[PDB]
Design a protein around this nucleic acid. Structure first.
Ligand SMILES: [Mg+2]
Ligand SMILES: [Mg+2]
Lengths: 149, 116, 44
RNA sequence: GUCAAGUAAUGAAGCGCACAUGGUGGAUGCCUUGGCAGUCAGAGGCGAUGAAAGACGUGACAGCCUGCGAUAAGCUUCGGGGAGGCGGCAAUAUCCUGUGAUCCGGAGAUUUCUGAAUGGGGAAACCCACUUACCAUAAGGUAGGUAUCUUGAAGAAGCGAACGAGGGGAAGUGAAACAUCUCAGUACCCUUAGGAAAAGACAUCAAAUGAGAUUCCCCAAGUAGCGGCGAGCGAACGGGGAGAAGCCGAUUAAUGCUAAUGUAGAAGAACAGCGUGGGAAAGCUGACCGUAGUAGGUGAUAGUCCUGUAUUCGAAACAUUAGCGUUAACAUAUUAAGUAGGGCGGGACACGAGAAAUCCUGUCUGAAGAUGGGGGGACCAUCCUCCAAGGCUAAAUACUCCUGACUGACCGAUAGUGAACCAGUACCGUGAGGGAAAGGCGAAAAGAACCCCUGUGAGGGGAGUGAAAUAGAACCUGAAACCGUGUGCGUACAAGCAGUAGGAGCCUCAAUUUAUUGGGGUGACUGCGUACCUUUUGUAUAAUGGGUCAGCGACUUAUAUUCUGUAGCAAGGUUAACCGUUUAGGGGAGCCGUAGGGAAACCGAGUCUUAAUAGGGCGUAG
RNA sequence: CCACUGUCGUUGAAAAGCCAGGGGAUGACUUGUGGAUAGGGGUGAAAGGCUAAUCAAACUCGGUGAUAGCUGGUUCUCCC
RNA sequence: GGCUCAAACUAGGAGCCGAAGCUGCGGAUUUGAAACUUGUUUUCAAGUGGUAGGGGAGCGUUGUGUAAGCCUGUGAAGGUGUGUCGUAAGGCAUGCUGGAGGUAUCACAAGAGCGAAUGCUGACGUGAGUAACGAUAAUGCGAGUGAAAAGCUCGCACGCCGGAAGAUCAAGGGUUCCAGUCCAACGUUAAUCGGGGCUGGGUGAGUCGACCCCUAAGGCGAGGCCGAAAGGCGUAGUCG
RNA sequence: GAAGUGGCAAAUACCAUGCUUCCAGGAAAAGCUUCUAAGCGCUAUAAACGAAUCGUACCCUAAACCGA
RNA sequence: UUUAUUAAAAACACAGCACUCUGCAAACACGAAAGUGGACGUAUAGGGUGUGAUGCCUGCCCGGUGCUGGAAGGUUAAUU
RNA sequence: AAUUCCUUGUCAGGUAAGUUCUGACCUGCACGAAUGGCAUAAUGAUGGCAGCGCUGUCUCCAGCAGAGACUCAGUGAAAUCGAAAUCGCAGUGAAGAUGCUGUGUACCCGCGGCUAGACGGAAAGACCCCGUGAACCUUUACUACAGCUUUACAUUGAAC
RNA sequence: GGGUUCUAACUCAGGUAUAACAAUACCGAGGACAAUGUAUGGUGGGUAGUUUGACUGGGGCGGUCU
């Protein structure tokens, strides 16, 4: 904290509580006792623990019917309404669509739909798998998950 | 995540000051004094829950002694006569009878005096 | 009684003034420090 | 009716408690124009063509702030843009503007005085000049020149973040004292660069099947060592990565092309009805756009109202980055002697003289020179390796005064910058220096015409505005301490932590077929009862601390390590740095466990000691 | 110019004064203006005096959040 | 208090009072044991004063996710009452105020809880309407103006200084000077007055002073000497 | 729309940077007057014209300075 | 003369006295050095120390510790 | 005795009465000759003692004048302060009580005085002790260093 | 293995010239001394950094400490 180098008054004789700095943590405008600094919040999650948790999550999704296998999901034009129709027939308006090799116009069609995200199987995460109402996985992505886990 | 203490400190102090209602001077107004007065009030109340059971037996015994001496007996002979007659009436009820029903207390004294 | 501050303009400008500061390397460090703090009064 | 005796009630100068209603004050909540920490990029300077920092001016208009400089909130031009505008507080007036203003971007012109300040001097913003050319005739005007140093006309100077390299170099502290030692080659002082710097190609290591410059990261490893063998200090070899490069011109500065960038900009989808409401974005109903749906606003919460966003995009001028070409400045060793080595004193090596290699050098000396020399931790021999006494060299690494974009389990006005506000200000100090406080009406000023009291004051009451005025400018909310007014009850014969347990009476709400209960206020009278914290053997203590309130104020963070729980794998477990189109996937280097004994060699379910095969010691789920 | 005595004043009219007295008053005198000496240093007809109301080592900033076997304080609740 | 064949003492006897001890009744809780058996149920037994301190279980607060959710102008947060629920920390509802936000649940992270530190900042008390109003040179009255006059102006009288308490400067200050106007704040009271606010005005030099010419002390100092650097000294000079 | 000149007294101011004495032995430099060196204007008489710039208010034994 | 601001004195200074150093590039002092002061002085001078007008005066002790001179012997550094 | 502990030594003088003073003695705890001895005119806001004058210093205080204090009007502090419905006594008690016991006394509230108590306020006792605290000073404490000095080598040579 | 002499290093805070300071030239005086660097013995409160115990019917003094 700025300043604070001099003893505010002499130690004895003024009738005041002794002070060493005007920037002591006791004073208004003083430093923070245990001032925070930047922290690194990342954890080491074991490789097998991460893999087993993904396994557990996928099994639980099947067990509560929140996983939907499709042969493929290919949007032919970067158009939001096309994907909205294709998801309304699948009965998953709020969905995480996991496909291997996410197509560069299915991404555009999905970008603006609120509770819809499109992911490739390498960038799927546990929180994404848990957060969406439904998951629409292609059979190719299910095979990739078989191999990865 | 900075936490401000204002709202909780306020409601905390209001609980104490509310328990201090009716106290004199700083004891109902300022927290440093009210909080001691509330703690001391609780201490007195705890002690007097015990002491009230002693005070009321004291009162019952006094009233029974008066009632028995009206009938020609002391308390320490009347209670002995009840225990010898196998009368289980408690001092609270005996004092109530002595105060509010003089003829029934006369009958009880007669029973105790026949037992002696 | 006589007090500590007895003002004299020539003496003020000759011990603390701008040219007195600029005559020394240490006075120029005084000036650099005052300018870094952004003081509206560099020198008396 | 008299007298006598006895015994109630009523009192309030004031005070207490509760409630009601205010004042003060400015907490709280909400809010933000300001901060804080970073990421990914860029850039890393400005200045004799006069800088940073200032002084004084400059407007239709008094001050301050902002801009600007006697061409003075500005002048010219080139681009953008298209309807308002003449910077803010902060309006008013005269006006300008489709003959394109204000505004934005590139370039230019002007650019007082001070300050390196440079014609001399000086208490900065001042005083005094010399000289050349021209003009004037008077007592001057215009345009220049005149510092010092270095190099042979060209440069330099000064200022300013951090990071680099270099010359000097503490002490508090720790060692529970303290001197070796530590702190620490730190703080600080001084010098001087560059976008990085330094280092760098083996007179380097290794001892392996050898490798092959420098730098940085993870391990090796808190190991080997050093050390009043104390407190502490603390490698290397090598392994895994990032980055790679070797040369003898890997230089500097211009200019000119070609490309790209940046410095203004342009377009940019789609919503209605009804009800509530001051106001609709919220509710109900039904639509639409979406390569644009969690943006900021708009009178309450908006994909469709505005600015935006997705997407597509523009450059007359100037800058920057590259590639190319060319110029002009500097440089271009030819293999290295006062050198290597040595004596003495110091220093650096993790290593404190040590058995002390190796490096550096104040002093004194002083080779061999390839049939030679240096190193391999005293030293000798052998073997390996490499050629000092010439110079250079990108990247990977360090940083942030700054520019751009973006981010935050960062703050939200006692916080966050000292500074959200005319803050490095006021104020304090001779000075170096220290260093505040201080945000919020409302959606819009619609900021209250007029009337009344008053002194044409202050202040208020009406009227009016507004959804709201105990939103009225000291203006959101509006706590507490503290101070009033009103109502109810108590209180002027009674001794103390002021309560508590009982308890009469009164007052007030409700019931209830009607003075009884229930709730609330008060509390005559009785019992009991010496605050709190700290510190103590022990405190009502006449021991400490606190006038009160509000706000703030003290066991954290990082790493290492051990134990416990929990989860995953399990005789195995796990990767680090890194890479990665990045929480994944890869990366097995390393670490822990799986064996111990012994100083060690060494041996191993054993081993050590011993002559002993005896005895004995230590050993025989992570 | 000084400061010997006393009263007053001591939250002063004043962070050293007033009043009444007192001493030197051509001198080793007093005083103006400018300058010099700087912190383990200065200066001192010497009291450790004075060095800006600060002196047995000034002040400011920095090392620095010195160290403190000492003192104070250490904030919600209940159960064993 | 008072007590004398006691209300004293001695030796005996019988009653009774007396504690948070024991018993009775209701409730909670720790541990252990038995059985529908991770509170699923009932029991039983032994326990439950506590500083330093160890162990166990929770409450609230800020923030992140859950949450483009849910609540909210038919009124969020905050404030202030009341009622109610829990062993507690505390929760829930609601009247009034307020006027734009809040947040269930479960996890997660803390600037996470204050009465004390002669703690820090601000506000406000007590002392107390108390002490004091700053030289004991001194005032009285009549007019005027004014909302208002002890204090202003004018007048008369009185008093004080007069080697000053008058006048001119230097230093220092910087507009305080003069006029008009205003009285909130400032002035230790009031104020119509003012060194206060606001608006205007006012400083005229060949001779007065500065500047200028000159030098003292003492500075700076082409070259020069010295010094790790920074710098120190010093000639000519140049300032002063 | 008047007067305005005689006596006496009398400074620490002036003569006087003088005079007299003493010892502790009492700035400097320029302006100024002359002399020449290198080198190649000066003195009188006037007449006309000039003399810049800055300060100047006010307090100053104080209510304006140093002491909040 | 002095303890600015509780001590003014018997304290400090003082003229005078004595010892001792110093031959001048003095001794001595400031300074890292240059450069200074001493001093544009020169032993009738300059420094240090004590004492403190003046009058009468100033005794004894050289073992200790200093200082001055001496060097026969003992011991003794770097170096070699 | 500015020195003398014993000690107010002894003796003389001064007073009615003299631990001080003056003179003397010498038994100098523990004077003494330039850290000078013994005197000394003059001088001193210097120390002690004694007188005259003079007195409110006092016996023993009285009266008076002015400025405060007091009352009114205006302005308006201070330190302190856990909270106070804040009495005596004898006891008790962390050992000296407004606050506890017993008892006695006491209607409620000011103003002018006053200072016995509130171990009153003020200043984290300077005395004293403690801390393996600090500072500064001393020295034949230790360990260093500046400075001063010795010798060797260098600058540094020749001849006899 | 010591002296003596010399001058040419070195010194001059001597003279003359160079404006002055300084340097330089010459003269003069000294002279392998002095002086300075390195090393080394001595001296060294001139100056620094520090140490200087505890128990203890307070501390010191005394005593004690296994
Ligand atoms: Mg308000
Ligand atoms: Mg002083």
């Amino acid at each position: 904290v700025s300043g604070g180098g001099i003893k505010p008054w002499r130690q004895k004789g003024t009738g005041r509580a002794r002070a060493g700095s005007i920037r002591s943590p006791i004073w208004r405008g003083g430093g923070r006792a245990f001032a925070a600094k930047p922290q690194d919040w990342s954890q080491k999650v074991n490789r097998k623990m991460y893999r087993g948790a993904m396994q557990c999550i996928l099994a639980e999704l099947i067990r509560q019917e929140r996983l939907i296998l499709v042969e493929e999901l290919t949007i032919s034009a970067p158009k939001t309404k096309e994907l909205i129709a294709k998801l309304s027939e699948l009965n998953a308006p709020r969905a995480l669509i996991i496909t291997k090799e996410v197509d560069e116009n299915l991404y555009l069609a999905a970008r603006n739909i609120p509770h819809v995200n499109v992911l490739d199987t390498s960038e799927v995460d546990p929180v994404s798998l848990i957060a969406f109402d439904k998951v629409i996985m292609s059979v190719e992505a299910a095979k990739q998950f078989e191999e990865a886990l | 995540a900075r936490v401000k203490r204002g709202v909780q400190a306020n409601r905390r102090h209001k609980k104490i000051l509310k328990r201090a209602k009716g106290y004199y001077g700083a004891r109902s107004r300022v927290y440093r004094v009210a909080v001691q007065a509330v703690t001391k009030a609780g201490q007195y109340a705890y002690r007097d829950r015990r002491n009230k059971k002693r005070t009321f037996r004291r009162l019952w015994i006094a009233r029974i002694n008066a009632g028995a001496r009206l009938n020609g007996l002391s308390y320490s002979r009347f209670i002995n006569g009840m225990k010898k007659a196998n009368i289980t009436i408690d001092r609270r009820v005996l004092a109530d009878i002595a105060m509010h029903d003089a003829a029934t207390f006369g009958a009880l004294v007669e029973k105790a005096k026949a037992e002696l | 009684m006589k007090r500590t501050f007895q003002p004299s303009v020539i003496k003020r400008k000759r011990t603390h003034g701008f040219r007195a500061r600029m005559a020394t390397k240490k006075g120029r460090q005084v000036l650099a420090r005052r300018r870094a703090k952004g003081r509206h009064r560099l020198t008396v």
